[PDB]
Design a protein around this nucleic acid. Structure first.
Lengths: 126, 48, 182, 48, 76
RNA sequence: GUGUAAGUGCACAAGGGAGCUUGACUGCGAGACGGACAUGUCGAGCAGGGACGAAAGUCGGGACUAGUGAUCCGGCACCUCU
């Protein structure tokens, strides 16, 4: 008989993030030659995918889970920068040149801005 | 009232743009920056 | 390397006391306070603005941080209130600031209340949040008696993590709240 | 923290009728605070 | 008192399902957003829906809104 | 609740708040709606020069539909016309 009175802060945060990601998906969509770079950020890791919405696939993906990018002793911003470089030349290997950056409903700053400029300086112009 | 007023350029002073405004909300002479065709750039347009 | 004594007390002995009283299945069902909100609704500020500035100074001196002016969100003719003019100030206290304000209030302000006979423990509402209101502002020594020119009470509310009135009242009593007995 | 929007903080020693020394931050510039009655000496808290 | 009325605005759907259209052709004339723009369909200043690319008009529903789309008919 | 009548819509907000700003632009405009004619309405996109944004991008007034008057005659400013 332990029923919390209201919504947990985790539920509020998840709902707000989903809602304001959907509100930005109104204008942002990915195509075959212009795919959408959607980034998901947690308190411990970051993940990025290259999504072609007209068919619903993922041409390339990168994250902090893999041990290669786990090995860098750098800070979370450094991990994001490495993830950005990894997604950048993985997309290079995928034949994709121009992308659109989907920030996934988070504020454009900190780690997200970090891997955004990391991908930008690696040759992926967007 | 919102009377029709004219905004002239600063350099060549041609009364190009016109619009209405409240003479009591902004009794002072309006200042706005607009595109001037013959000069080809963006300069402020002043009231007359 | 520095903690408010109220926070130390809650973290060390009050948490254990609540745990043994209610036998929570997991260590994060322990009810702890979240924030303390101070309201002073002027109401008469619809006539004169300087009352709002006075309330701003009162809240700034009492809480220690600049309050927020609450606008009138509905226009009512009987109170000759329209949209846009200020009505009341409000301060949200969290963390160390809330702990220190609670300690100061409990140990200083309440005994300074004239003929202070206690606070009724019936003011909780379902989720164990205590809302009580004062009448003046002289109980705090942060604000000087000669400085004031008109009494101004407030509405203190302490929203806690607790789910029931019993747990909230137990937590407040362990915190040192001077409740009556009924 | 907005720098110029809040009052000043200082080590304040709260003095009660019982003579207890209470070093804790507040906004009073006197440094040491003398208070006649508090929870330690109030009849309500002491059961009198 | 009565006797004042406004002229009819001739609103409604101009191109129905299956009709082929050219770029910029007006599809529906509406006051509200009764039909929402879909693929290759824009929205005007007065909520007028117009074709952005040639093809066949195709009426569909998306998330509970009725929408108008343009099917890119196959080149011969 | 949407400035304002009603209707059609808008909670994905077109509703509420904040930052900067003046596109409440210049030359145009494929294709259309409606219509006796004159009126009227929508418009992707191109160029110039800008605003906002990290970017994609949006902006040729306002959620839309009312707030207005043809022709003649005359005033003012500019023109490499006579």
């Amino acid at each position: 008989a332990h029923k919390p009175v209201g919504q947990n802060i985790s539920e509020v945060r998840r709902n707000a993030r989903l809602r304001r990601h959907a509100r930005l998906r109104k204008k942002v969509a990915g195509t075959a030659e212009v795919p959408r770079l959607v980034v998901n950020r947690s308190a411990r890791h970051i993940h990025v995918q290259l999504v072609n919405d007209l068919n619903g696939t993922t041409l390339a993906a990168a994250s902090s889970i893999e041990a290669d990018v786990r090995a860098i002793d750098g800070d979370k911003k450094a991990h994001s920068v490495r993830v950005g470089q990894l997604i950048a030349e993985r997309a290079k290997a995928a034949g994709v040149e121009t992308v659109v950056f989907d920030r996934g409903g988070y504020t454009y700053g900190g780690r997200i801005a970090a891997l955004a400029d990391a991908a930008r300086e690696a040759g992926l112009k967007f | 009232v919102r009377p029709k007023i004219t905004l002239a350029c600063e350099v060549c002073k041609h009364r190009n743009y016109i619009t209405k405004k409240n003479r009591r909300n902004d009794p002072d002479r309006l200042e706005i920056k607009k595109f001037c065709p013959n000069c080809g750039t963006h300069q402020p347009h002043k009231e007359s | 390397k520095a903690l408010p004594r109220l926070k130390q007390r809650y973290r060390e002995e009050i948490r254990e006391a609540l745990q043994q009283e209610f036998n929570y299945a997991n260590v994060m069902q322990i009810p702890g306070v979240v924030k303390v909100v101070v309201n002073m609704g002027v109401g008469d500020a619809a006539r004169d603005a300087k009352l709002i500035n006075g309330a701003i100074n009162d809240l700034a001196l009492i809480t220690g941080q600049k309050p927020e002016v609450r606008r009138a969100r509905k226009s009512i003719a009987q109170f000759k209130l329209r949209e846009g003019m200020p009505i009341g100030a409000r301060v949200t206290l969290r963390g160390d600031r809330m702990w220190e304000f609670l300690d100061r209030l409990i140990s200083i302000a309440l005994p300074r209340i004239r003929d202070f006979r206690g606070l009724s423990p019936k003011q909780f509402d379902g989720t164990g949040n205590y809302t009580f209101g004062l009448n003046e502002q002289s109980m705090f020594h942060e604000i000087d008696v000669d400085s004031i020119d008109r009494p101004r009470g407030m509405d203190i509310t302490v929203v806690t993590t607790a789910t029931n009135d019993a747990e909230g009242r137990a937590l407040l009593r362990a915190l040192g709240f001077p409740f009556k007995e009924n | 923290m907005k720098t110029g929007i809040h009052p000043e903080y200082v080590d304040t020693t709260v003095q009660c009728g019982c003579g207890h020394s209470f070093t804790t931050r507040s906004t009073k510039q006197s440094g040491t605070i003398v208070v006649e009655v508090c929870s330690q000496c109030h009849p309500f808290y002491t059961g009198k | 008192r009565n006797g004042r009325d406004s002229a009819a605005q001739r609103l409604g759907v101009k191109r129905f399902g299956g009709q082929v259209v050219k770029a910029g052709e007006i599809l529906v004339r509406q006051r509200g957003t009764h039909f929402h723009p879909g693929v290759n369909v824009g929205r005007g200043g007065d909520d007028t829906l117009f074709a952005l690319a040639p093809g066949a008009v195709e009426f569909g529903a998306k998330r509970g809104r009725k929408t108008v789309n343009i099917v890119p008919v196959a080149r011969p």
